[PDB]
Amino acid sequence: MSCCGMAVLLGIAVLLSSNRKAINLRTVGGAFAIQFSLGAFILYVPWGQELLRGFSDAVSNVINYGNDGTSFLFGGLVSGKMFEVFGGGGFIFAFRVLPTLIFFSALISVLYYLGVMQWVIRILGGGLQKALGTSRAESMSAAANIFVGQTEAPLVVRPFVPKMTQSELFAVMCGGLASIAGGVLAGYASMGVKIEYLVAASFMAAPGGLLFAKLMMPETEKPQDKPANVIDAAAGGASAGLQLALNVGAMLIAFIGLIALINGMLGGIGGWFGMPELKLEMLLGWLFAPLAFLIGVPWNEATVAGEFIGLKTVANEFVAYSQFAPYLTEAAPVVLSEKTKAIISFALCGFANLSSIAILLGGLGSLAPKRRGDIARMGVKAVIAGTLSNLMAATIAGFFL
Amino acid sequence: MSCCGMAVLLGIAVLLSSNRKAINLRTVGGAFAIQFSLGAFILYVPWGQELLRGFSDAVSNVINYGNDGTSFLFGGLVSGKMFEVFGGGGFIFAFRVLPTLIFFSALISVLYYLGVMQWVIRILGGGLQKALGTSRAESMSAAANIFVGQTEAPLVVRPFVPKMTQSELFAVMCGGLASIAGGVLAGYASMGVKIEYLVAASFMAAPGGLLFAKLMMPETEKPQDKPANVIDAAAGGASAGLQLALNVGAMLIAFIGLIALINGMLGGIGGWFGMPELKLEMLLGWLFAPLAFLIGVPWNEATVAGEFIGLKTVANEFVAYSQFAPYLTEAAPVVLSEKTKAIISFALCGFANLSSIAILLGGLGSLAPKRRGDIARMGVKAVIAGTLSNLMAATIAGFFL
Amino acid sequence: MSCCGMAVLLGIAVLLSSNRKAINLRTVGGAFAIQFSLGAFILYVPWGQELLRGFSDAVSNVINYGNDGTSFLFGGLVSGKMFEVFGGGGFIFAFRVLPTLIFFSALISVLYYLGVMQWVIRILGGGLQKALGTSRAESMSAAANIFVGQTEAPLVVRPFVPKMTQSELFAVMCGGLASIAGGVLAGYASMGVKIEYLVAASFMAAPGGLLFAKLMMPETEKPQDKPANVIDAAAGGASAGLQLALNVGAMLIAFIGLIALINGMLGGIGGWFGMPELKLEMLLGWLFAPLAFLIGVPWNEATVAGEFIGLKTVANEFVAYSQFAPYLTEAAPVVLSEKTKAIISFALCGFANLSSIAILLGGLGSLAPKRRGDIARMGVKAVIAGTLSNLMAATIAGFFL
Numbered sequence A, B, C: 001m002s003c004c005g006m007a008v009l010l011g012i013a014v015l016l017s018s019n020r021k022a023i024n025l026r027t028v029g030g031a032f033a034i035q036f037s038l039g040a041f042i043l044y045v046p047w048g049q050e051l052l053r054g055f056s057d058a059v060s061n062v063i064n065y066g067n068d069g070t071s072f073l074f075g076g077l078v079s080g081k082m083f084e085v086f087g088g089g090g091f092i093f094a095f096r097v098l099p100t101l102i103f104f105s106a107l108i109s110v111l112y113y114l115g116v117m118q119w120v121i122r123i124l125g126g127g128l129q130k131a132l133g134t135s136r137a138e139s140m141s142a143a144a145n146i147f148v149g150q151t152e153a154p155l156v157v158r159p160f161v162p163k164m165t166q167s168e169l170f171a172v173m174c175g176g177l178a179s180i181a182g183g184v185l186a187g188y189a190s191m192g193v194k195i196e197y198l199v200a201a202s203f204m205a206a207p208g209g210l211l212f213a214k215l216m217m218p219e220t221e222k223p224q225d226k227p228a229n230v231i232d233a234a235a236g237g238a239s240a241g242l243q244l245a246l247n248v249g250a251m252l253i254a255f256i257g258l259i260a261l262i263n264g265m266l267g268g269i270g271g272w273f274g275m276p277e278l279k280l281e282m283l284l285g286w287l288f289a290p291l292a293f294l295i296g297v298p299w300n301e302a303t304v305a306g307e308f309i310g311l312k313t314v315a316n317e318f319v320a321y322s323q324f325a326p327y328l329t330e331a332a333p334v335v336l337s338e339k340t341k342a343i344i345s346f347a348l349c350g351f352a353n354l355s356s357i358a359i360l361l362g363g364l365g366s367l368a369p370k371r372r373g374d375i376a377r378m379g380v381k382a383v384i385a386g387t388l389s390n391l392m393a394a395t396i397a398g399f400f401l
C-alpha cells in the first residue's frame, strides 16, 4: 500500500509536468533513490538510527540551553510551579514555544558568521549536484533549506538568482516549500513533535524537493556556472527571530480564532442539512482521508489524520501542528498508532501552502525583482510539488516504520 | 435639558462654520434627522431595540470565538483559575483585551477580500448620499467608518481623495474622528462597555460625522463623479492588528504612567494652594462638568462624568475607557445611574482627539500627499466637529434613555 | 592602588593617542579634574551626597509612578501575590523591567517637547566648553548623553555633525559609548542596581567621555561655530520605547541562551584538559581580574568582579547587569563588599562595547551619511575610549568609597 502510494505521488507529478519528455531520468531517478535511501538509512538501518538519535539529542540539548534565556525573561511563568497551579494550562505557548524561534535565529546567524553553515551546505549541495546533475546554485539552495527557511536559503546563491532558468527558479521555490526551518523545528519540538521525525523530514526535503521540481518542471534551458563581528551577528539573528515570533504569534491568535468562528457558522449551516455538529475538522478529515490512506495511514485512523494534513495544506503547518500536538500526549482525544503519528509528523513537515507563495514573492523576489512575474506564475505548481515531497517523505517513513 | 443640549451643540457648529450662508439645509437637516431617528429606532422603538440586541449578541459571539486563539497562546493566564489566585487582578488586560484587536483585524480583512464589507458599505453610503445630497465618495467613507478606523475607511474611495474638494476632505476627516473601529470596539466590549452602546454609537457616527462636517465646512466647490487569497487576507489583517495591539499597549503603559506622574506633581503643586489632593481627574471633572450636564448628565453625576469625557478629549478614548471601565462593575468607586453610564459610553465613542490629526496626516495623507497641508490646516476644526458628533450622539442616547 | 589605577588608565590613552603632541593639557587636565571633582562632590562631600540622594529619590519616585501603567496592563502578574506563589521567580523581568523603558522614553520625549531637556543640556554643555575649550557641538552632545542614548544625544546638534572635525565626531562617539540612557537606567534600577551609582556614573560620563576622546584623538583641525503637541510627543516616545523594549527582550533571550550553550560546549572542551567545570564566566573572570584589581577591587573579589566587567565588554552592559543583579540581593552566590559592588556598578555603566559601533553607524550615520566611513574607522578606538571612561569613573568611585 505504501509502494502504491509512492507510485501515485510520482505519477501525479508526471501528469502535471511542463514536459514529460524533457524529464531527466538520472536526475529524478537519483533524487528519489536518495530520499528513499536516506529514509532507509536513518529510520531502519541500526547505525543510521543511532546517528539520527544522536543528532536529535544534540538538538534537544541546544533547545534546553536556549531555554535559559526564556527562564530569565519570564521566570516563574515557565517554571514547574505553573503545572501545579494551572494543570495542563500551565504550559503557556507564548512563553514556552515562541521564544525558541528567537534563540535559534540568533544561533543560525552565528553559525553563518563563523562559516559553519556554509561548510555543511557546500558538502551536501555538492553531493546533490554531482549525483543528480542539478545545477550548482539550485543544489546549494536545496541543501540550505534543510536548516533555514524558504526566503533565507536562496541567500547562499543570491547573485545567481536573477539569471536562473525557469526550472532552476522553480526548484529553488520547491526546496523552500518542501522544507521548514531550524527556528520553527525547535518550536514544533517544544510542542511535543518527535525531534527525530523533524530532523529526518528536514534532510529528506532536499532530495525530495529536487525530485518533484525536476519531475514537474524539467530543465529545458541551459543553466550558468555580513555583520561586523559575531556579537552583531547574534543580535541580527535575535532581531529577525523576534519579528518571526511576533508574526507567528499573531497568526495563531487570528487563525485559531477564525477556525472557531468558522466552526460556529458551520454548526448553524450544517444544521440546515441535519448536521448541527458540522465542523471544519470534519470537512477536512472527510476530504483528505483518502490521501492519508494512500500514504499508509490505517483505514480506521485515516479520517483523523486527514484533519491535520488538510489543515496544513489549506492554512499552514504551524496551525496544523498546533492542533495535532495534543494527540501526542496522554490526554489525546484519539490514541493513534506510532506509525500514524510518524506519518502525520512527516506529512506536516513543510512550508507547502498557498500563503507561502506571497512570502516567496517578497523574500525571493527581492533577490531578483524582474523574476516576480515568474514566481507568481509558478507558485501553485511549486506548492503542489512541495506538498508531494512532504507526502512522499511520509509514505517512505510509513514504509520503514 | 437634552433638547437644549442638542441646540447648543448645533449652534456651536454654526458659529464655527466656514460660511453659514453656504450651509445646505437639506444636507444638515437630513443628517441630524437620520442620527436622531436612528437613535430613536434602536434605543426606543421595540423592534429596533431587538435588532440592536440581536446584532450585539452576534458581535459578542464573534468576540468569544476569537478568544479561542487567545486561549491557545496564553493558556492558564486567561483561565478562570486566575481569578481564584489573583482576585480582581486576575484579569490581565494585555492578554484579555489586546489580542482581540488582532483577531478582529484579521476578520475584517477577510470580509473585505470576500466583498462583504463593500456590499454593506455600498448600501449604507448609497442611502446617505441620496438622502443628504452629499458626494458619492464622502458618503462611502462615512459608512466605512462605522466598521473600520479613520485611516482605513477612506481606502474604499482612495483614487478620489487627491481631487476631493476641501469640504469633501474635511468630511472624510470628520467621519473618522466621529467614529472608532471594529477592532477597538471589541476591545472596549471586553473591558465591560456595553456592546449595544458601542454598536449604536458606531452607526450613529456616520450621519453625525456628516452633520457637523457640513455645518462647519459646507460645500462651496463642485465635487466630481488586494491579497492573492483569503488566507493571505487573514494573515495581512493579523499583522496589521498585531502592530495596532503593540502600539495601543505601549501607549497605555506610557500614558497611564504619565498621568500618575502628573498627579504626583499636581499634589505637590496643589498643596501650595491648600489643595494637596489635587489630581488631573479633578481638574478635568471641574472643567468638563458643565459639558456633561449640558448633554444630560444629572447635576450630582456631572463632575465624575466630566473626568472621563475630558480625558477622552485631551488624550484619547482608549485611555478614557480604561479609567471608566471600573465604574461598570460592582466594585465601582461611584455607583452611576444607567442613563449616565450610557451617556458617558456614547460621548467617549470616537477617535476625536488632537493626536488623531497626526494619524490622519500619515494615513490619509499617504493617499494624497499633495493634500497634507490641507489636512493639517483643517485638523483642529475636524476634531471639534468629531467631538460635537460624539456629544450629540450621547445627548440623543440620553434623551431616549 | 586607586591612584595607580587612574595613572595607568590615563597612560593607556596617551599610548593610543593619534598624536600625543597635539594633546591639549587644558582640555584633558580640566576634563579629568571635573570627573574627579564631580565624584568627590557627590560621593564624599556631605552636601553633594545629599543632592545625589535627593536626585536619586526623585528618579525612584518617577519610576514608581510609571509602574502604574505597568500595573494596568499586566495586573496580578506584577503584584505581591506573585512572590507568594512563585517565590523569587515571582519577579517577571519581561513585565517588571522592560515596560519601564517605554514609560521613560515617553517622558523624555515630553521633556524635549517642553524644552526642559534642552535647558539643562545647554547649561551643562556650556559649562563644559567654557572650562575645557571643547567645541560647542561636541560639548552639548556630551551633556545630552547624560540623559539619552548614543544615537539620540547628537540630535541636539544634528546640523553640525556632517561638517564636524574627525576629533569632534570621535568625541560625539565617545560621549555615547561612555554613557547609558535614561530608559535603561530605570531598567537597571528596577533590577536592583543602586540609583545613586547610576546617576553618578551618568553625570561623570560627560567629562569622562571628553577626557579620553581628547587624549586619544586630540583636535588637529579647526571646528566651526518636532511633534505637533505634547500628547503626540508622548506617543512618539512610547513607540520608540516599545521598539527598544522588544529589541532588548529579544537580545536577552538570545544572548543568555547563547551563553548557556557556550558553557555547555566549554564544559566538554574543558574536560579534554581536565577542566569539565570550565565556563565563560571563569574565562572572563580569569582574563579581567587584573583589570578589576587595578581599578580598586580587593584581591579576593577581583575574579568575581572580572566576570561582570568582562561580560559587559565582550557583549553589553545589559547582559552584564542581568548576571550581576543577583549579587545585590540576600541570595547572592558571593557576598561582596560595598566598595566592590559600587566599583562594578560604575564600571558596567556604559554602552562601550563593539556592537555599539554598528548602532552608531546607523543612528549617527543617518545624521551624516558621508561620515559613515569615518565612524567605522574610529569605532574600535572609540569603544576603548568609552571603556576607559567607565573604568576611570569606577576607580574614582572606589577611591572616595
Ligand SMILES: CCCCCCCCCCO[C@@H]1O[C@H](CO)[C@@H](O[C@H]2O[C@H](CO)[C@@H](O)[C@H](O)[C@H]2O)[C@H](O)[C@H]1O
Residues within 6 Å of the ligand: A314, A315, A354, A357, A375, A376, A377, A379, A380, B228, B229, B230
Ligand atoms: C482557514 C481554513 C479554511 C480554508 C479555505 C481554503 C480556501 C483556499 C483559497 C485558494 O484561493 C486561490 O488562491 C490562489 C493562490 O494564491 C489564488 O491564485 C492567485 O495566485 C496564484 C499564484 O500567485 C496565481 O496562479 C493565480 O493566477 C492567482 O489567482 C486564487 O486567486 C485564489 O482564488
Ligand SMILES: CCCCCCCCCCO[C@@H]1O[C@H](CO)[C@@H](O[C@H]2O[C@H](CO)[C@@H](O)[C@H](O)[C@H]2O)[C@H](O)[C@H]1O
Residues within 6 Å of the ligand: B314, B315, B354, B357, B375, B376, B377, B379, B380, C228, C229, C230
Ligand atoms: C495627558 C493629559 C494632559 C492634557 C494636556 C493637554 C494639552 C493639549 C495641548 C494642545 O496643543 C496644541 O495642539 C495643537 C494640535 O496639534 C497644535 O497645533 C498644531 O497643529 C494644528 C493641526 O495640525 C495646527 O492647526 C496648528 O497650527 C499647529 O500648531 C498646537 O501647536 C499645540 O499647542
Ligand SMILES: CCCCCCCCCCO[C@@H]1O[C@H](CO)[C@@H](O[C@H]2O[C@H](CO)[C@@H](O)[C@H](O)[C@H]2O)[C@H](O)[C@H]1O
Residues within 6 Å of the ligand: A228, A229, A230, C314, C315, C354, C357, C375, C376, C377, C379, C380
Ligand atoms: C558572547 C560572549 C563571547 C565573546 C566573544 C568575543 C568575540 C569578539 C570578536 C571581535 O571581533 C572583531 O570585531 C571588530 C569590531 O566590529 C571587527 O572589526 C570590524 O569593524 C571595525 C569597526 O567598524 C573595523 O575597525 C574593522 O576593520 C572591522 O574588521 C573585527 O572584524 C572582528 O573580528
Ligand SMILES: O=c1ccn([C@@H]2O[C@H](CO)[C@@H](O)[C@H]2O)c(=O)[nH]1
Residues within 6 Å of the ligand: A148, A149, A150, A151, A181, A183, A184, A244, A316, A317, A318, A350, A351, A352, A353, A355, A356, A359
Ligand atoms: O522561517 C520561517 C517560518 C515560517 N514561515 C512561514 O510561516 C508559516 C508558518 O510556519 C510557514 O508555512 C511559512 O509560510 C516562513 O516563511 N519562514
Ligand SMILES: O=c1ccn([C@@H]2O[C@H](CO)[C@@H](O)[C@H]2O)c(=O)[nH]1
Residues within 6 Å of the ligand: B148, B149, B150, B151, B181, B183, B184, B244, B316, B317, B318, B350, B351, B352, B353, B355, B356, B359
Ligand atoms: O484602528 C485604530 C485604533 C486606534 N487608532 C488611534 O488610537 C487611539 C486610541 O484608540 C485613537 O483615538 C486613534 O487616534 C486609530 O487611528 N485607528
Ligand SMILES: O=c1ccn([C@@H]2O[C@H](CO)[C@@H](O)[C@H]2O)c(=O)[nH]1
Residues within 6 Å of the ligand: C148, C149, C150, C151, C181, C183, C184, C244, C316, C317, C318, C350, C351, C352, C353, C355, C356, C359
Ligand atoms: O537607548 C539605548 C539602549 C540600548 N542601546 C544599545 O543596547 C545595548 C544594551 O543596552 C547598549 O550597549 C547599546 O548598544 C542603545 O544603543 N540605546
Ligand code: NA
Residues within 6 Å of the ligand: A144, A145, A146, A147, A148, A149, A150, A153, A175, A176, A179, A180, A181
Ligand atoms: Na527550508
Ligand code: NA
Residues within 6 Å of the ligand: B144, B145, B146, B147, B148, B149, B150, B153, B175, B176, B179, B180, B181
Ligand atoms: Na471609523
Ligand code: NA
Residues within 6 Å of the ligand: C144, C145, C146, C147, C148, C149, C150, C153, C175, C176, C179, C180, C181
Ligand atoms: Na548616553
